[PDB]
C-alpha cells in the first residue's frame, strides 16, 4: 500500500529523514507533532507522524499534496516514506501567521484593498482546488486554515483536525452527498469575517452557531456599509441551497473587479 504511494510519487519528492532538520514544535494533533525546521536550504514546516486509519490518512494527504501547485495553496516540499517510524510531511514555512490572528488576536485595522487582496487570494486557491481533474473539497475552510505572507497575500492550507417527499429536512440532507459548494459557504463566512473583523456569531459557541445556520436559517448581519458587489457575493454565497452558490471562478472575477475601483 505504501509501496504504491512510493511509486506514484515523483522522485524529487522523496525525502530522507536525515535530510530534514527539526528545530521547534509548532503544534500537536492526533497524527503526531508539527515541527518547524530546515530542509533543502528552505525554512519548512514538518508534519511528523507518530493503525490502518492513520496510514490511510498519510497516503491520502501526500496524494493530495503532490498534485498541488499554485501560489495561493500550501507548497509541498517532500515526504519521507521509508518506514512508518520515519513518516513526515514537509511544506514551505509561512511566517505571517493565520488570518484568524490578524483579525481577532492582533486586531489590526485593515484597508479595504488589504481586505480584498486576501479575499481574492483565497478565492483563487479554492478555484484551483475545485478545478483539478479530480477536484478537492477543502471541507474545512476557515480563517485558521488561511495563512498569510508578511506583504499581505494569502495561502490556503489544512492543519488536519426511502421516499424523499415525506423526509425531514435533516434526514434528506444526510442522504445528499455534499459537493464543492460546501466550500463556497465556508468562504462566504470568511469573507464576512474579513470585512467586519468579527468572528461569525462571535457571541455563540461553535455548535450553537452551526444550529442557527442550519435549523433557523440565520446568517451574520450584512450592514449597509458593505459594498454592493460583495454583499451580493455574501447573500448568494451562504445560500442554504448549494446550487444557488456561485463558483469560485465567478467569485474571483467579481472580487478582482472591485480591486480596480479602490
Ligand atoms: C506556521 N507556518 C506554516 C505551517 C505549516 O503547517 C502545515 C500546514 Cl498549515 C498544512 C499542511 N498540509 C496541508 O495543508 N495539506 C493539505 C491537505 C489537503 C488539502 C490541502 C489544501 F491545500 F488543498 F487545502 C492541504 C502541512 C503543514 Cl506542515 N505549513 C507552512 N507554514
UniProtKB/Swiss-Prot annotation:
Outcome of swapping residue 78 to D: In CCDD; pathogenic; the mutation results in decreased protein solubility; causes abnormal aggregation; markedly reduced protein expression is observed in the sarcoplasm and nuclei of patient cardiomyocytes; severely reduced autophosphorylation
Transmembrane segments: none
Residues annotated as binding ATP: 26-34, 47
Effect of residue 91 to A: In CCDD; uncertain significance
Domain called Protein kinase: residue spans: 20-259
Active site: 140 (proton acceptor)
Subcellular location: Nucleus; Cytoplasm
Effect the entry attributes to changing residue 129 to F: In CCDD; likely pathogenic; severely decreased autophosphorylation
Tissue specificity annotation: Highly expressed in both adult and fetal heart.
Phenotype upon changing residue 64 to F: Increased autophosphorylation
Post-translational changes noted in the entry: Autophosphorylated.
Stated family: Belongs to the protein kinase superfamily. TKL Ser/Thr protein kinase family. MAP kinase kinase kinase subfamily.
SUBUNIT field: Interacts with TNNI3, ACTC1, ACTA1, MYBPC3, AIP, FABP3 and HADHB.
Function of the protein: May play a role in cardiac physiology.
Recorded disease: Cardiac conduction disease with or without dilated cardiomyopathy: A cardiac disorder characterized by atrial tachyarrhythmia and conduction system disease. Some patients have dilated cardiomyopathy. CCDD inheritance is autosomal dominant.
Record protein name field: Serine/threonine-protein kinase TNNI3K
Taxonomic source organism: Homo sapiens
Amino acid at each position: 500500500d505504501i509501496l504504491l504511494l512510493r511509486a506514484g510519487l515523483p522522485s524529487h519528492f522523496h525525502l530522507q529523514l536525515s535530510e530534514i532538520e527539526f528545530h521547534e514544535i509548532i503544534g500537536s494533533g492526533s497524527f503526531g507533532k508539527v515541527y518547524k525546521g530546515r530542509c533543502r536550504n528552505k525554512i519548512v514546516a514538518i508534519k511528523r507522524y507518530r493503525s490502518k486509519s492513520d496510514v490511510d490518512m498519510f497516503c491520502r494527504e501526500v496524494s493530495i499534496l503532490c498534485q498541488l501547485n499554485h501560489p495561493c495553496v500550501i507548497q509541498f516540499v517532500g515526504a519521507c516514506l521509508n518506514d512508518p517510524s520515519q513518516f513526515a510531511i514537509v511544506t514551505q514555512y509561512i511566517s505571517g501567521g493565520s488570518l484568524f490572528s490578524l483579525l481577532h488576536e492582533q486586531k489590526r485595522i485593515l484597508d479595504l484593498q488589504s481586505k480584498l487582496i486576501i479575499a481574492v487570494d483565497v478565492a483563487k486557491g479554492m478555484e484551483y482546488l475545485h478545478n483539478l481533474t479530480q477536484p478537492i473539497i477543502h471541507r474545512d475552510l476557515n480563517s485558521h486554515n488561511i495563512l498569510l505572507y508578511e506583504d499581505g497575500h494569502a495561502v490556503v492550507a489544512d492543519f488536519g483536525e426511502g421516499n424523499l417527499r415525506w423526509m425531514a429536512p435533516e434526514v434528506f440532507t444526510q442522504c445528499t452527498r455534499y459537493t464543492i459548494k460546501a466550500d463556497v459557504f465556508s468562504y462566504a463566512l470568511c469573507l464576512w469575517e474579513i470585512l467586519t473583523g468579527e468572528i461569525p456569531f462571535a457571541h455563540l459557541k461553535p455548535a450553537a452557531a452551526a444550529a442557527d445556520m442550519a435549523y433557523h436559517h440565520i446568517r451574520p448581519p450584512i450592514g449597509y456599509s458593505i459594498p454592493k458587489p460583495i454583499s451580493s457575493l455574501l447573500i448568494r454565497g451562504w445560500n442554504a441551497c448549494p446550487e444557488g452558490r456561485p463558483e469560485f471562478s465567478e467569485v474571483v472575477m467579481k472580487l478582482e473587479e472591485c480591486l480596480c475601483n479602490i
